[PDB]
């Protein structure tokens, strides 16, 4: 839909859409920018991720409200029908993001920072599919999330310092996957503890600004560990 707009204009409008809290627009502008075919810079990757996390974040919040009402109900078909409609729209957004990563962001991503970023996104969007999956492919959806997070993890440990914010956020989200999706709370706790401790030991190497960036995400790891232990 955005094929007649300049790449730079799509990026500019995505930033304006963020300021205006118009995340659906923001996502459509960044989809348009990806479909131009060029690789994305670090900032552009963040705009793509923020746009879709907000969109799918609202859908997930709505799905959880409707799923809760429906569980207390089982009235009429309406609560299930509406939960299903929201679910299909959420699945469609996750399929769109996965499609962008598959065509062709991941295969063109050769630096560790970009490749880890996109594989973490792939794990996250399969994770959102898994949250609403029930049937024949649910086990396969979970494995698809696991596989993406694991490849990202293997690259990040080889190529990034333990305080790198992407590496830290990948481990945080993979630990959530283990706790909430994989029914592996001990794997979740071990991953969060080891990630936290290895970052702590590397903070001495950092500037004041980078210290602030890494410690912010470390505190999210600590908040989870406090809830889980």
């Amino acid at each position: 839909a955005m094929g007649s707009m300049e790449r730079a204009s799509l990026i500019q409008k995505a930033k304006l859409a963020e300021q205006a809290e118009r995340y659906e627009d923001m996502a459509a502008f960044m989809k348009g920018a990806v479909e131009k075919g060029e690789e994305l810079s670090c900032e552009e990757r963040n705009l793509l991720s923020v746009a879709y996390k907000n969109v799918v974040g609202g859908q997930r919040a709505a799905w959880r409200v409707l799923s809760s009402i429906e569980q207390k109900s089982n009235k009429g078909p309406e609560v299930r029908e509406y939960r299903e409609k929201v679910e299909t729209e959420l699945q469609g957004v996750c399929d769109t993001v996965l499609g962008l990563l598959d065509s062709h962001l991941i295969k063109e991503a050769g630096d560790a920072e970009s490749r880890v970023f996109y594989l973490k996104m792939k794990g996250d969007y399969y994770r959102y599919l898994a949250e609403v999956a029930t049937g024949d492919d649910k086990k396969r959806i979970i494995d698809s999330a696991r596989s993406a997070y694991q490849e990202a993890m293997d690259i990040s440990k080889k190529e990034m310092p333990p305080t790198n914010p992407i590496r830290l956020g990948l481990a945080l989200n993979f630990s959530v996957f283990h706790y909430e999706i994989a029914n592996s709370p001990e794997e979740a706790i071990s991953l969060a503890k080891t990630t936290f401790d290895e970052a702590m030991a590397d903070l001495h190497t950092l500037s004041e600004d980078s210290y602030k960036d890494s410690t912010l995400i470390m505190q999210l790891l600590r908040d989870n560990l406090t809830l889980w232990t």
Binding site: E18, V50, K53, G57, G169, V176, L220, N224, L227, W228
Partner: peptide, 9 residues
């Protein structure tokens, strides 16, 4: 259990 907010930046 919270994941990366990731809703601003």
């Amino acid at each position: 259990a919270g994941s990366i907010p990731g809703r601003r930046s």
